[PDB]
């Protein structure tokens, strides 16, 4: 390594470490409301399929039979990963999807 | 494409592929019993119109003259698409409508 | 057409094609005996009018002169429509009315 | 509306628009001959009542005095609605009932 | 999957899951009163046919002989599916049709 | 930007651009036959309503008075958007619905 | 939910919400004139039965004794549901049936 | 950092910042017409359910009782998020759905 | 080269080889789970397109017809590069995507 | 300059010109396959945006409207610098990206 | 110092000041185009992050919120050291990065 | 040693100790700013690698896991030799590299 | 040679052998640490080039492929002259450069 | 000159011509290897500068453009004085510096 | 002084003034080329130090700031004694050292 | 001793004491400037060795550690015999050698 070589490296490093570089903006909250919409779209469709199967106002278990990509337990379908609890309450007649703070309550006739 | 951009895409894809999505529940069997009822409703009406035309117990051909949205052959009116064979037998005095397994036999005086 | 609309139509069709609906009971034979009585009532009256005209035991042609609503031929008054042949035989001294199987023979002095 | 929901609606619409459905057979001509008989039955009865009132062969006006459910004019009783003109001609000694093509001429002694 | 593609999907999902979507209103009770009327219409007609057959006040068994689309047992015609029990009581002289709460009692002379 | 950072981006881009990604399958032809069925279902219903209004075999203009979501012209109801020409011909006694190649001819008594 | 999936849903929704769909034409007024005829047919028959019972011109109460499917009060038989008031006036010698605007006055000898 | 390392980074950056990268095309207007169709599909269905409930031409409030995923106020159902005002006017006999410029007017008999 | 020049190079080399320099962290496993999600997102969409094409529960071959950027063989779509085997088994009714250890099983009705 | 000073410089030069020094490994070919992937990722996204704009299978010009950082000509989008010709052929239904030997052909429905 | 010692120094100096010695080639212009590329890479990424935050076409201020290693003023992000002015103009819909003569204009939808 | 020899040495020493000879200019401060740039370049890269590992905003310990050629302690990575303390403060959201007076503060989202 | 000449030489030799004359300070150890730094700088760069070639964590042989000015044997690159053994051990994940006592161990992920 | 003076000169000359006096050791060969190292150090640096200029593997003429203190001819840079021929051969990919027997071959990628 | 003593002095003087005695060979010209080399060696080093200070191509005044043992004036560093004018000309890009006829021109980038 | 012998000695002494005989010219001042140059040459070299040892600007004690042939005291190296005081002053940044009137001040960076 000569003296002149390092001098030229000092020049180049000054330029090449003097650039715009973007940072990690956390956009989970943005995607969570997108997720909770997309889930809520399926919950409507699943309910509409349950009504053809049940030929009447379907039960909350019959509604969660239709969605896939996540398991059920009692009366709360959660996604494959532990989020998006679409919890209903047949007495109240309403589903409520909630990814991670961002939520979306929808009211359908369940018994 | 920067490193930080892909990192943010890895975050978003995790969320947006973690939703309820409904599946194709086959509800043909449900609609077939609805079809075979709706057809059987018309077969009653068609028979009642045949009785005014014939001024008496009408023949099985006179009964299939009245329904539309499907062709006849001998003594079996089938729908436009090949289903819903409302087959009678004048000796037995009964029509029998059958969409695709789901069926509905009705007994009227035919000669 | 939405999914929910057809589901509701499937419910309604099940109910509205689940009713009592009466059938064509052939009651011609019942009316034929009623007809042959009503005709026989007139044949008595017509004979009684013939006796005042003829001032004696009337001929079989004089008796069929009185009834109306049907033509004569030789010695058999038939109705307007081809039924109810009230045929007499002056040698046997008896009329016989017959609509369509159901019959009613009456014996009066004819020459 | 999800993609899967419409796909299921496409299946159901195919089935539920594939049924026998009866058509309007025009049976006026059938009922017109029934009407003209029922009217002709009353014209006989009305004439028989006129003969007790008149104590003799009754006039054509005296005969139309008895029927109801329709007005007279000169010598033609028409029904409430403009049909069923039972027109007589006392010179010819015959009534003729005519609903709408289907007719029934009856011959009684009128003066 | 690029970052910009998911961003556009987040926009579209917001719009396409923001629509009116109708719910399953249970209209069985509406159709039950329609059913019980349509059945009661047939029970009148069947009784009127029984009176021509019986030439008098008909028995309760003779009345249920005429309707079709459902079986009898003792003195209660039920529809094909277990509903619409048109039960009479010859001592009380009245039929009573009842689909599923919605009912229609009619009083005819039965022996 | 260091050398090692780009090397890691080269690794990630290889993986993240190596996925299944679905393509636009044109399913208009599928929906056109679904449309032409749904339209044909309404044309039947509209005709049945026209028969109650007209108390007889209705005219082709009276039939197109009932459907909505599209304009008429002479004797061809087209949808709001220029498709689904349900064209009749009263002389031939048949309607014919046609979305965009996929068609459905139905024959009812029109004058 | 991928971008391509929603794009295909946008195509399908355009087609499936572009159909003829019939509207509720109010045909009560049509059925009211049919009702008031059918009621008026029974009022004639009931009067004819009253004349055999009374062996003479029957009273207005004796005439309303015969019809069923509705109650009486003073001198006005109304149907089970509050409509179709067949009101007579023995002084005027005429019944008048009126469902709901559509009416039918008939004149018979009542005392 | 050696001189040769930066030289190689200068080569790589030239290549890796020389790619196609897609831009955000605003497709709200596309989805708004899809939304306003999907909403208009439900408004038809909701009206058809209102007609079974009301057993007649339903009121504008009865029609907005059926849709879900958004609130009402007076006579204008808006979606959960402030868009898609399906405003009717019972005097004019027409609903009008409007997402955000893209609109869809439909005419049904409302009182 | 003077003595003083090398002395100054000895000073500079000490400083310029005394810096933080990042190392290659292997983030394939991170991208593999991102890949297997993105692939699984497409497999859902492709299945939903297959259901519109097949108008029913689609076959496993019809589902792999839709994805692009990789070839099929028998019943296993692999990516362009040999990874991401989305293997189904129609008897078991489930797809399973697997990039390179990181996997994602999804259950849809396949025949 | 003394004799001893140069002797010490002869010692130092021997050591300081006896080091590992890395060479320019040409890694363009490595970055070209990374480039052609990153470009191909955008071509997929751009096509998916074209499908929402075109509401159907988009033209090859509509697809190249979306990418940026390079110009188009006829039917070949090239980057800002003359490389990465993503050339399609609508008849063949396939794009082909090629940086500089390293290439990546992808098949989408273009018209 | 002897005579012979200096004579030997005269020999050595002749050799040791007879070598290749490299000169300072100014390679700022080379690094400036590398810088302006690396900055332009970040400006793309920052814009793509702004689109997820803004859920739409982002403003020019929202885009400069994401890059780091330099300050903003009005509508021109400059690096920490006074160079690399990535100046946009929302009316023209294009960013332009310029290190020091070497520049790179990129066109994205900004409002 | 002769007199003439020393006289010649006196001449030569006058010339050979009459030359330009360069001095030690301390250029540590120059290299320190070059060092603190090169370190700051790695701190950016290390942070970008931490974001892929952490799939989110990474912790300050996860960021110092990636750089090499120096040890950590608590929350301050120092070089192998005791200099270049890149100290962060997760509460303040900023790293600060400092070789020996010459410093470089950079602000990234750390938690 | 005269007496006075030697006397003057005795004077001059006293002065000219009474000077500062510098000694050979052994500065190999100083240059060895400079060498081992300069070598270690190249070993970092060579590793960073190996990572682009290998597209992953490179092998120890791939790393020694890049440096020049010295030969390899098994897993130890030595300089042209027998010194500066940069020996790695892939199991331990660390290179160690050692000129001649003065050493410099660096830890990078090698397999 | 006295006798005693010369006698004393004979004594002194004996002493003053009885001393150590060093001889000319030819140390060109020592300096030639020092020269050929110092030249080879510059040839490395010059090559590293050529790579930034050429942005790739530089030509042999571009490499000899950087060194100074000597002329070029075809493909052999010689020093100002006719020695130190650093001759390359781009086909063989290696420079070779040679002062005067003592040589130093170095292998770099030249084209 | 005896006769014999002088005779012996005559003998000795003959011998002692019959010796080789060296002459003053002027070797300034030899040392001037050695000087102008040693000065030129420093001018190279001083320029290399100026490039680290200036972080770029240094000015001619910055280059003469580094050498010592002589004063400057305008743009010509002369030694302490008036010789060795290393005169540059920034426009021509070359220094020229000249002791006293013997000269040495060297070409470096000066501004 | 004869008379003639002394006469001949008188002749010879006249000749032999009639010669050029050189005198002692004091040339200390000439050698002192030669000494102070030779010492100053070593002081430069010693300083250059101190800079490699100290790896920076060396102290005045470190500089006098290198010369030999004379002792030090505090900050003034004197020769073996008491002359040639090379006295520095670190605050002033300059050495000054002085043999015996004839002096030579040189300015180097000392601390």
Numbering used by the authors:
A (entry chain A), B (entry chain F), C (entry chain B), D (entry chain C), E (entry chain E), F (entry chain G), ...: 1 to 111
Authors' description from the paper:
Proteomics and knock-out mutants reveal that the narrow pilus consists of a previously unknown pilin, which we name PilA5. In contrast, the narrow pilus has a zigzag-like appearance in projection, owing to a 15 Å wide groove that winds through the filament. The diameter at any position along the long axis of the filament is therefore only 45 Å. The glycosylation loop in PilA5 spans amino acids 54–71, with amino acids 62 to 65 forming a one-turn helix. The C-terminal β-sheet is composed of five strands, one more than observed in PilA4. A disulphide bond is formed between Cys60 in the glycosylation loop and Cys88 in the third β-strand. In contrast, PilA5 has a total of 2 negative charges per subunit which leads to a patch of negative charge winding around the filament. In contrast, PilA5 contains a single intermolecular salt bridge—between Glu68 (subunit A) and Arg23 (subunit D). Supported by our curvature analysis, narrow pili comprised of PilA5 appear to be more flexible than those comprised of PilA4. We determine two functions for PilA5: it forms the main structure of the narrow T4P and is a requirement for cell motility.
